[PDB]
Amino acid sequence: GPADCCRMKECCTDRVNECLQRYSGREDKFVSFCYQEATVTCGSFNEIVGCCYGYQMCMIRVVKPNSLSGAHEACKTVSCGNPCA
Amino acid sequence: VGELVYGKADIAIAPLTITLVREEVIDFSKPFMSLGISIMIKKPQKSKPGV
Amino acid sequence: AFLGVERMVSPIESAEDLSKQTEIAYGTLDSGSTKEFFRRSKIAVFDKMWT
Amino acid sequence: GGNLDSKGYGIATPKGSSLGTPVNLAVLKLSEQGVLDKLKNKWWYDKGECGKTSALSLSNVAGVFYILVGGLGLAMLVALIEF
Amino acid sequence: SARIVAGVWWFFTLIIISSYTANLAAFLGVERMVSPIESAEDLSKQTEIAYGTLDSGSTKEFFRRSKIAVFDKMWTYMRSAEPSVFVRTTAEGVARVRKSKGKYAYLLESTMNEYIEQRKPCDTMKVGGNLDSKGYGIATPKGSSLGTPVNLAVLKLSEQGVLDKLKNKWWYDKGECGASALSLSNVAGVFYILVGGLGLAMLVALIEF
Amino acid sequence: VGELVYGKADIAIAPLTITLVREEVIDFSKPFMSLGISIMIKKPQKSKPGV
Amino acid sequence: VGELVYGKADIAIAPLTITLVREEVIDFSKPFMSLGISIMIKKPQKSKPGVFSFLDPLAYEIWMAIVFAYILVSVVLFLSARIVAGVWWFFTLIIISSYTANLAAFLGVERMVSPIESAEDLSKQTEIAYGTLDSGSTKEFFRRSKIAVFDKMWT
Amino acid sequence: GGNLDSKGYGIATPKGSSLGTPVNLAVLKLSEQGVLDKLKNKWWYDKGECG
Ligand SMILES: CC(C)S(=O)(=O)NC[C@H](C)c1ccc(-c2ccc([C@@H](C)CNS(=O)(=O)C(C)C)cc2)cc1
Ligand SMILES: C=C(C)[C@H]1CN[C@H](C(=O)O)[C@H]1CC(=O)O
Ligand SMILES: C=C(C)[C@H]1CN[C@H](C(=O)O)[C@H]1CC(=O)O
Ligand SMILES: C=C(C)[C@H]1CN[C@H](C(=O)O)[C@H]1CC(=O)O
């Protein structure tokens, strides 16, 4: 049962986004929470790194309250970086 | 941590270890005390000389 | 030889020595930051210890 | 001796900068992953040039030489009080 | 009067002979001392003794591509260290081991090590076990007709002991290097002063009579 | 390996170490000799201790 | 091997020794483990020091030399004597001290004796019986071996 | 004493099976990565009951 890469990534972004949709206006505050849950649901090659790290960082630095949709739409294509380190 | 996230407590003061997993959910103040994972064993008996 | 044997022997120095011997069992708490540290650890020695 | 006080260094960022939290989480990750430790060991200790002895000491015997000369002194004393 | 003289001198010579005995015990302990390097790991743990591999080949690449801790650290050291610890040829590396007064260690395959260890001047040796376990082989282009016959042939030679006999032929048989305590030399001096003392004794015995 | 791949030689017989990188490009026969990465130093000399 | 040839199994993972006869019918992956036919016996009780462990810390050369030195000093005294007794005392002092120290370095060996140091020695003696499994690559090796020693052992 | 002969074990696959080459490359990768070594050390030595 391999987790591949891309499937894991698209899962990661999708779960992060879907999670952040639940918190309206607090979106910028809960990015790490939703990333945690997303890393749990989609699994990770490195527990510390998470499903997609670069996406997480992109979201954290970009996402502002109520700015969720555009921010995510911009951040989901970004390079995830090294999944093992 | 749970009480903090779900708002059953306004602050948490205790020997709470700072971890990235906890830093993601909560906010940690600068460390008020320093520590590290260490090893504890039983000290050897000094002497049992006899003749 | 006796007097030599008394002082010469060192029971334990560091965690690595714990990793290298099966004679002295060792462990942590059922939960908390230490166990989780060992679990998530990709560092050789701690990995071995966790296993 | 020990340290007078216990404090630490840190990466500093302007208040309300977007970089602050990413930098912080990065430092935590590096800490737990052991990156900080290995880095410090790299620069401080690893290339450290400063790093049991089977050899002779003339000094240990000196005391007994002193007690010998003292004994000979007392010997001269007795030799004198006799004559 | 003379009693305390004899006593003090006796105590003095007592502590001195005891101390001599003990220190000598320490020196013989020094010769008894083992394990300067017992493992690959020890080279990783000490910076005093430099070590290296060939400029290219399977060993260097093994270290480069290795993700396991010790060898990784070793690779880091080797790549970063100056002057270069890498040598062009095997003979150059061995020569470096010989010239370095034991300050340089050479990482090379078990075969070459055993062979050079069996060759004069016989000043070199292999320490500890092997880092990895692998083998040589006869190589053939993919999809060649020779592959299976060659393979079955190598198997035949293996079971027949031809390979073994061959290695024994080239390695050990032609080898020029060949196959506890109580140093006599140290005592020889005290024997010499003994004979000298007896000589002086004969001298006095003659001058008296 | 190159001479073999580009067909300038039909076979290669030499102390060629079996590696995954080489096994991917060419075909290796079963190993005719066993070896491993090892450490070589200069043997110490206790000769001529003297008086 | 049979299950493999007749298609009752798609793959074989086991301590299966690579042999030419099996390599002819089947395909062997590169060897995942290295081994060889070896000899197993019951570990002996420690051989005990014996009396020679006493003559170990002082080489035979030192004993012969100290005897010749002894009789030489004796024949010197036979023919002033103060320096003889003094030099001899110094000599025996250095020797007993050196022996004490070296003995300390020597301690016990506590090494057991080995009845048979190699395969051939089993071929040379009928006292210790030896054998292999009822089947498998080892027995087959002994059977087909054209080498003198192994031939004798198989016989 | 030493060994009488030098040989090895192996994974066996039917001639012309599709699994053969994947299995082979897998064994090679495991070899270089030290998985085989670690495995033997796991089952043979690490739990070793003698000394
Ligand atoms: C049947 C014979 C041709 S033989 O047994 O294969 N070769 C005889 C020759 C003495 C020999 C015997 C055994 C080995 C040998 C060497 C290493 C290993 C294991 C530890 C690693 N496997 S590997 O194939 O070398 C690796 C690189 C994947 C297993 C076997 C290498 C060479
Ligand atoms: C004492 C307990 C249960 C706490 C205290 N600090 C660690 C923590 O904050 O999780 C725990 C201990 C440990 O797991 O080493
Ligand atoms: C002697 C040389 C250059 C060859 C032999 N085997 C290794 C190989 O198959 O590349 C090389 C040595 C090494 O890499 O340590
Ligand atoms: C256990 C058995 C019968 C097997 C195991 N290895 C050898 C083999 O693979 O044939 C046999 C042992 C042997 O021949 O002594």
Q: Using an 8 Å Cβ cutoff, are A45 and A84 in contact?
A: yes
- Which ligand 4 atom lies nearest to the CA of residue G14? 9
- Asked if B23 and D24 come within 8 Å (Cβ–Cβ), the reply is yes
Nearest to A37 by CA among A57, A14, A63, A54: A14
Question: Which of G19, G133, G134, G141 to mutate for ligand 4's pocket (most ligand atoms within 8 Å of CB)?
Answer: G133
Q: Using an 8 Å Cβ cutoff, are E20 and G97 in contact?
A: yes
Which residues of chain H lie closer than 8 angstroms to C22, CB-CB?
46-48
| Length of chain H counted residue by residue | 51
Instruction: Point out the residue among H9, H27, H30 whose CB comes nearest to the CB of G35.
Output: H9
Angstroms from A77 CA to nearest CA on chain C: 28
Nearest to G103 by CA among E159, E24, F21: E24
For chain C, the distance separating the N- and C-terminal CA atoms, rounded to the nearest angstrom, is 38
- Nearest Cα residue to atom 10 of ligand 3: E57
Ligand 2 neighbourhood includes B16 CB (under 6 angstroms): yes
Q: ∠ CA(G38), CA(G44), CA(G48), 5° rounding?
A: 140
Neighbours of chain F (3+ CB pairs under 8 A): E, G, H
Which among F20, F30, F33, F34 is the top mutation candidate for probing chain G, defined by the most G β-carbons within 10 Å of its own β-carbon?
Answer: F30
Please give the torsion angle defined by the CA atoms of residues D19, D20, D24 and D25, in that order, rounded to the nearest 10 degrees.
-50
CATH of the domain at A44: 1.20.120.1800
- Report the 10 Å Cβ neighbour count for E4: 14
- Asked if C40 and D34 come within 8 Å (Cβ–Cβ), the reply is no
- In the structure encoding, which two tokens stand for residue D16, read together? 């309300």
- Helix axis angle, G81-106 to G60-77, nearest 10°: 170
CA distance D65 to G77: 33
Provide the residue range defining the domain that includes A71.
1-85
Q: How many structural domains compose chain A?
A: 1
Q: Using an 8 Å Cβ cutoff, are G76 and E201 in contact?
A: yes
H or E element in which residue F38 lies: strand F37-42
CA distance E1 to E19: 28
Resolution (A): 3.5
Nearest to E98 by CA among G38, D60, F41, G114: F41
Taking every pair of Cα atoms in chain C, the longest distance, rounded to a whole number of angstroms, is: 46
- Give G42's contacts (C-beta < 8 A, 6+ positions apart): none
- Give E175's contacts (C-beta < 8 A, 6+ positions apart): E118, E119
- Nearest Cα residue to atom 4 of ligand 4: G136
- Report the 10 Å Cβ neighbour count for D43: 9
CA distance B9 to G78: 105
CA distance D33 to D25: 12
Nearest to G16 by CA among G40, F20, G6, G29: G29
